[PDB]
Amino acid sequence: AKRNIKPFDGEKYAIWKFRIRALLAEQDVLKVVDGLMPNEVDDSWKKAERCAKSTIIEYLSDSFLNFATSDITARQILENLDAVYERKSLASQLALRKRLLSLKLSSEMSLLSHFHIFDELISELLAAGAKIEEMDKISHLLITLPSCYDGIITAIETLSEENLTLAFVKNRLLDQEIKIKNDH
Amino acid sequence: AKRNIKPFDGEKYAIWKFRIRALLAEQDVLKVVDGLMPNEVDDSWKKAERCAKSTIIEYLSDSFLNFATSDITARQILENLDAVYERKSLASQLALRKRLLSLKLSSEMSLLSHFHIFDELISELLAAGAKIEEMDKISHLLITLPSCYDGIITAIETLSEENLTLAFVKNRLLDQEIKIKNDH
Amino acid sequence: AKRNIKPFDGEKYAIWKFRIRALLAEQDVLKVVDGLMPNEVDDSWKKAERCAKSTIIEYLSDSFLNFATSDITARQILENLDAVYERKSLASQLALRKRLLSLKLSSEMSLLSHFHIFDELISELLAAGAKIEEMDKISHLLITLPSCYDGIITAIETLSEENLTLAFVKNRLLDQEIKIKNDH
Amino acid sequence: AKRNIKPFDGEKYAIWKFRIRALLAEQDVLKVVDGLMPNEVDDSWKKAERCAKSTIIEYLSDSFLNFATSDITARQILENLDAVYERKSLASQLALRKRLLSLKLSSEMSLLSHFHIFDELISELLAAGAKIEEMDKISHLLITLPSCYDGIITAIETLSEENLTLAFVKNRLLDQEIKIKNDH
Amino acid sequence: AKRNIKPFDGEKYAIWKFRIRALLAEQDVLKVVDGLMPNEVDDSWKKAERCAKSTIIEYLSDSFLNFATSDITARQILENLDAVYERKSLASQLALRKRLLSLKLSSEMSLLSHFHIFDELISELLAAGAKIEEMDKISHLLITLPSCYDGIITAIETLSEENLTLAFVKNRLLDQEIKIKNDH
Numbered sequence: 060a061k062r063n064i065k066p067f068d069g070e071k072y073a074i075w076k077f078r079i080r081a082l083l084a085e086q087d088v089l090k091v092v093d094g095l096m097p098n099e100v101d102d103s104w105k106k107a108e109r110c111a112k113s114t115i116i117e118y119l120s121d122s123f124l125n126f127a128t129s130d131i132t133a134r135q136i137l138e139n140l141d142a143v144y145e146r147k148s149l150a151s152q153l154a155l156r157k158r159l160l161s162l163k164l165s166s167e168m169s170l171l172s173h174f175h176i177f178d179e180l181i182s183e184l185l186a187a188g189a190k191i192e193e194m195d196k197i198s199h200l201l202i203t204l205p206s207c208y209d210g211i212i213t214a215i216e217t218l219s220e221e222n223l224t225l226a227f228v229k230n231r232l233l234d235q236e237i238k239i240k241n242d243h
Numbered sequence: 244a245k246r247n248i249k250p251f252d253g254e255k256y257a258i259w260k261f262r263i264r265a266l267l268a269e270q271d272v273l274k275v276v277d278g279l280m281p282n283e284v285d286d287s288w289k290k291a292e293r294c295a296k297s298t299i300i301e302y303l304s305d306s307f308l309n310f311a312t313s314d315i316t317a318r319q320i321l322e323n324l325d326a327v328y329e330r331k332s333l334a335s336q337l338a339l340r341k342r343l344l345s346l347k348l349s350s351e352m353s354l355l356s357h358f359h360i361f362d363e364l365i366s367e368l369l370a371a372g373a374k375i376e377e378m379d380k381i382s383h384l385l386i387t388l389p390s391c392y393d394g395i396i397t398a399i400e401t402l403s404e405e406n407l408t409l410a411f412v413k414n415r416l417l418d419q420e421i422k423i424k425n426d427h
Numbered sequence: 428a429k430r431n432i433k434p435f436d437g438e439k440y441a442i443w444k445f446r447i448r449a450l451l452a453e454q455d456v457l458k459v460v461d462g463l464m465p466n467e468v469d470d471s472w473k474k475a476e477r478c479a480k481s482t483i484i485e486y487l488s489d490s491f492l493n494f495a496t497s498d499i500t501a502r503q504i505l506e507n508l509d510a511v512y513e514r515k516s517l518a519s520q521l522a523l524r525k526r527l528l529s530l531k532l533s534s535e536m537s538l539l540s541h542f543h544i545f546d547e548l549i550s551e552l553l554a555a556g557a558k559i560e561e562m563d564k565i566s567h568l569l570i571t572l573p574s575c576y577d578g579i580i581t582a583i584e585t586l587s588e589e590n591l592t593l594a595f596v597k598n599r600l601l602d603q604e605i606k607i608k609n610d611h
Numbered sequence: 612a613k614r615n616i617k618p619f620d621g622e623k624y625a626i627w628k629f630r631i632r633a634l635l636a637e638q639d640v641l642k643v644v645d646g647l648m649p650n651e652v653d654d655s656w657k658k659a660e661r662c663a664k665s666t667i668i669e670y671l672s673d674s675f676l677n678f679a680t681s682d683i684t685a686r687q688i689l690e691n692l693d694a695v696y697e698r699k700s701l702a703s704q705l706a707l708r709k710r711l712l713s714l715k716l717s718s719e720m721s722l723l724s725h726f727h728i729f730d731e732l733i734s735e736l737l738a739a740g741a742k743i744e745e746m747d748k749i750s751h752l753l754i755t756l757p758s759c760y761d762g763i764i765t766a767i768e769t770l771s772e773e774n775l776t777l778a779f780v781k782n783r784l785l786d787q788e789i790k791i792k793n794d795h
Numbered sequence: 796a797k798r799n800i801k802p803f804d805g806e807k808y809a810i811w812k813f814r815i816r817a818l819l820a821e822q823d824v825l826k827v828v829d830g831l832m833p834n835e836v837d838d839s840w841k842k843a844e845r846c847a848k849s850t851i852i853e854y855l856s857d858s859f860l861n862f863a864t865s866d867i868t869a870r871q872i873l874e875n876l877d878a879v880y881e882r883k884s885l886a887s888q889l890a891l892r893k894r895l896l897s898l899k900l901s902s903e904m905s906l907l908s909h910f911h912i913f914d915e916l917i918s919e920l921l922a923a924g925a926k927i928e929e930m931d932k933i934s935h936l937l938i939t940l941p942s943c944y945d946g947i948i949t950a951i952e953t954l955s956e957e958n959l960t961l962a963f964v965k966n967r968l969l970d971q972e973i974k975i976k977n978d979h
Contacts, residue, residue: 060244060796063301069929070962074305077312085297087290106823113821117799121810122921128813143929148958150966158970185306193253193327222332226254230334234342244428247485258489261496269481271474369490377437377511406516410438414518418526428612431669442673445680453665455658553674561621561695590700594622598702602710612796615853626857629864637849639842737858745805745879774884778806782886786894 061085066120071186072144076137079118083111092134108132150187155180162203170236174229177203196225204232211235245269250304255370256328260321263302267295276318292316334371339364346387354420358413361387380409388416395419429453434488439554440512444505447486451479460502476500518555523548530571538604542597545571564593572600579603613637618672623738624696628689631670635663644686660684702739707732714755722788726781729755748777756784763787797821802856807922808880812873815854819847828870844868886923891916898939906972910965913939932961940968947971 064078065071083089091111097104111133119127127136159180164173177200184191201212211231215223219231248262249255267273275295281288295317303311311320343364348357361384368375385396395415399407403415432446433439451457459479465472479501487495495504527548532541545568552559569580579599583591587599616630617623635641643663649656663685671679679688711732716725729752736743753764763783767775771783800814801807819825827847833840847869855863863872895916900909913936920927937948947967951959955967 061297061301062246062798063250066799069960071305074308077308078300081297081300081311084293087293109820109823113797113817116814116817117797120918121807122918124810124813125921125926127817144960146958147960148955148963150963151970154966154970158973182304182306185309190309219332222330224253224328224331227332227334230338234335234338237342245481245485246430247434255489258492261492262484265481265484265495268477271477366488366490369493374493403516406514408437408512408515411516411518414522418519418522421526429665429669430614431618439673442676445676446668449665449668449679452661455661550672550674553677558677587700590698592621592696592699595700595702598706602703602706605710613849613853614798615802623857626860629860630852633849633852633863636845639845734856734858737861742861771884774882776805776880776883779884779886782890786887786890789894 064118066118067123067140068120069123069144071149072140072147073149073188074186075118076140079115079137082114082118086110086114088114091132092137112136148187150183152184152187152189155184155187156189159184159199159203162199164204170229170233173203174200193224197223197228200225200228200232207239208232208235248302250302251307251324252304253307253328255333256324256331257333257372258370259302260324263299263321266298266302270294270298272298275316276321296320332371334367336368336371336373339368339371340373343368343383343387346383348388354413354417357387358384358416377408381407381412384409384412384416391423392416392419432486434486435491435508436488437491437512439517440508440515441517441556442554443486444508447483447505450482450486454478454482456482459500460505480504516555518551520552520555520557523552523555524557527552527567527571530567532572538597538601541571542568542600561592565591565596568593568596568600575607576600576603616670618670619675619692620672621675621696623701624692624699625701625740626738627670628692631667631689634666634670638662638666640666643684644689664688700739702735704736704739704741707736707739708741711736711751711755714751716756722781722785725755726752726784745776749775749780752777752780752784759791760784760787800854802854803859803876804856805859805880807885808876808883809885809924810922811854812876815851815873818850818854822846822850824850827868828873848872884923886919888920888923888925891920891923892925895920895935895939898935900940906965906969909939910936910968929960933959933964936961936964936968943975944968944971 061078061082064075064082067075080089080092083092088107088111091104091107112127115133115136116124116127126139159177162173162177162180164170181191181196181199201208204212211234215228215231219227245262245266248259248266251259264273264276267276272291272295275288275291296311299317299320300308300311310323343361346357346361346364348354365375365380365383385392388396395418399412399415403411429446429450432443432450435443448457448460451460456475456479459472459475480495483501483504484492484495494507527545530541530545530548532538549559549564549567569576572580579602583596583599587595613630613634616627616634619627632641632644635644640659640663643656643659664679667685667688668676668679678691711729714725714729714732716722733743733748733751753760756764763786767780767783771779797814797818800811800818803811816825816828819828824843824847827840827843848863851869851872852860852863862875895913898909898913898916900906917927917932917935937944940948947970951964951967955963
């Protein structure tokens with residue numbers, strides 16, 4: 060019912076496990092993975108085990124189905140997936156942040172492609188575990204721009220103080236890149 | 244079950260919150276976000292909290308999952324998302340309307356691309372909160388056209404008075420741009 | 428559960444309303460839109476109202492969500508959408524049929540592109556409300572062809588009399604356009 | 612719930628009807644289409660009729676919604692669709708098989724495009740009602756190849772006798788077309 | 796409800812059967828395929844048979860619907876599909892591994908395309924039944940690289956010992972291919 064989980068393919072295991080656990084908790088099945096094993100198994104417990112195993116099988120890619128082929132419970136599958144991918148880092152936060160700080164808008168590139176690159180970098184940083192607020196995102200975006208946008212920078216800083224987000228800043232930046240391109 | 248909600252990525256928070264609230268109300272779960280906290284928690288209340296948290300987790304992008312990683316209720320998640328994005332403007336309505344009023348059909352561009360641009364502008368204006376009626380949409384579309392369409396403008400104004408919408412006007416405009424292109 | 432309804436964007440309102448009404452009737456909820464308002468509201472009636480409003484919200488585009496933002500029932504939303512789009516025509520049937528009758532296969536164009544154009548025209552005509560039988564579709568397709576296909580026309584007319592549909596006719600036409608292209 | 616049915620657009624009516632009947636039988640609703648009309652209608656029968664009509668409406672294209680606009684039961688809709696498309700042939704099996712037997716791999720074309728063409732032809736033949744076994748598919752694929760693959764043909768014939776399918780044969784053929792392209 | 800199963804088209808039958816069996820077990824229906832035939836049939840057993848047959852029909856391609864057209868139970872359908880595809884090999888593991896070991900990064904190709912090719916090869920190997928650990932994947936990826944990456948190889952080997960996976964290794968490799976391309 061929750062088709063918003065990307066199948067696990069060895070990348071971003073923390074997000075996949077979080078979404079899988081949320082989905083299992085939605086179906087009142089997470090007690091199999093988390094709760095203690097009951098002394099006597101009931102029909103409800105067997106149904107919950109089947110549902111958890113089926114969900115994990117559904118949200119595993121064809122390459123990773125070998126983790127569920129053996130007659131093991133969903134708890135064992137998650138334990139193995141943890142032992143292989145639990146504490147392992149997804150990327151280098153310092154490298155990504157160095158790339159982000161070195162980002163600069165080029166004359167040939169338009170603001171749409173630059174915004175896409177900035178969004179990809181920010182999304183990768185946030186997926187890696189870094190915590191970036193909206194103000195920090197805006198500051199990075201503004202420092203990754205040439206000096207032709209100083210007018211809109213001043214206007215945003217002085218006027219839109221209680222109304223600033225990434226979307227509004229990007230919209231204003233595109234609005235004035237239209238004028239900047241016209242004035243060349 | 245409601246897969247028509249775009250995951251939240253920091254853009255158009257009002258629409259996302261409205262759709263999420265509608266979906267939660269559909270599942271008889273919105274009482275968690277809206278209703279007062281009961282003195283004693285029951286199994287039904289815990290199930291509702293789990294369902295609301297799972298829904299919000301499902302309809303949040305991978306970048307924004309940090310708002311739900313902490314052991315907080317769905318109400319707290321929505322409160323934080325509001326504190327970051329509730330009253331913030333999505334775009335500049337005056338800038339969008341200035342761009343729309345300055346729109347003009349060029350000789351190289353066909354009516355399909357012009358209609359797509361007009362539709363994108365109108366959709367952005369409506370998402371920003373502006374209220375545009377069908378007559379206003381038609382008036383903008385007609386004033387964004389050259390003088391070669393005056394015949395169809397007069398025919399639509401005089402004949403199709405109780406039958407005018409954007410779709411019919413666009414269809415007639417394409418029908419006569421065929422003839423205009425033939426007569427060149 | 429019925430994800431086969433295109434969200435309403437101001438085009439083809441009759442089809443959208445028909446599909447929405449069918450979906451509401453499937454969920455035993457159409458009594459809210461159609462049935463009379465009960466003297467005393469019950470929990471079942473409130474649940475039905477919530478479900479209908481949530482369904483209509485789900486199957487409305489982001490541009491048209493303003494019809495549901497106000498605290499109004501699903502019946503009121505449908506009444507407003509009717510008052511704006513109920514009896515309004517979708518396109519010009521005479522113009523579409525004139526374009527269809529004037530369709531002719533060109534030497535440069537292959538039969539696949541011609542079939543796609545013919546299918547698009549027929550689909551638009553049927554969506555506009557016109558009633559076209561299979562024999563009429565076949566007749567239009569055959570009269571929109573050059574004289575190189577007279578052999579297959581005669582073979583289809585004489586042999587396949589109780590076995591003729593658009594798909595079979597198109598398949599035979601492609602089969603012999605292979606030979607016609609070979610014989611040039 | 613069964614979103615694997617392509618909406619009916621006048622092509623492949625047998626497959627669409629088979630899938631629709633299977634879906635209706637899954638929901639315990641096929642008794643409306645198949646079973647006799649009860650003397651007295653009940654709430655369950657009306658619910659089943661609504662569900663069947665809604666399912667058929669959902670899995671009908673916008674062009675074919677005119678078959679359900681009138682206040683008719685799902686049984687009547689299926690009866691009309693049968694009267695228009697039940698016994699009519701989908702394509703010419705002899706023509707498709709003549710095209711398949713005449714298929715030959717060209718020097719310019721790679722094995723991927725040839726395999727795609729062969730798969731499309733086989734799929735069309737199977738949809739038309741023809742019965743082709745795996746051995747026949749393999750024989751057609753092998754006879755549609757040049758003499759440069761005789762080594763792999765002999766190896767497959769002699770060694771892989773209890774292990775031959777279309778996928779394995781295609782994989783071996785690509786494996787040795789790598790070598791054949793290298794040896795040129 | 797489980798839309799993550801690719802319809803069966805004669806390729807990768809083991810994965811399709813595993814996913815179908817998991818889905819059937821989720822719905823408490825696998826007892827039809829696995830359990831013994833009861834002496835007396837009940838309404839529950841007939842409902843389970845209908846559900847299993849409908850699921851198998853849904854997750855079968857249009858080419859393979861002939862396995863279910865006849866009035867046979869889901870158990871018979873699976874038995875026939877096994878008799879045609881159960882023990883048959885999907886590809887040549889030795890050929891795939893020879894291709895993987897011979898993989899080498901070329902100057903023209905970027906690391907993204909090379910990573911895509913490596914991922915495709917590894918996925919095909921894992922689908923064929925081979926068991927490859929994360930360390931083996933990393934070793935193959937590293938031996939499929941030129942000598943310009945020896946610095947990052949040494950850094951990963953010495954520093955990231957308890958933190959190594961394919962994703963992190965690929966990210967570091969791209970990070971330093973940026974520098975390598977800059978230094979040319």
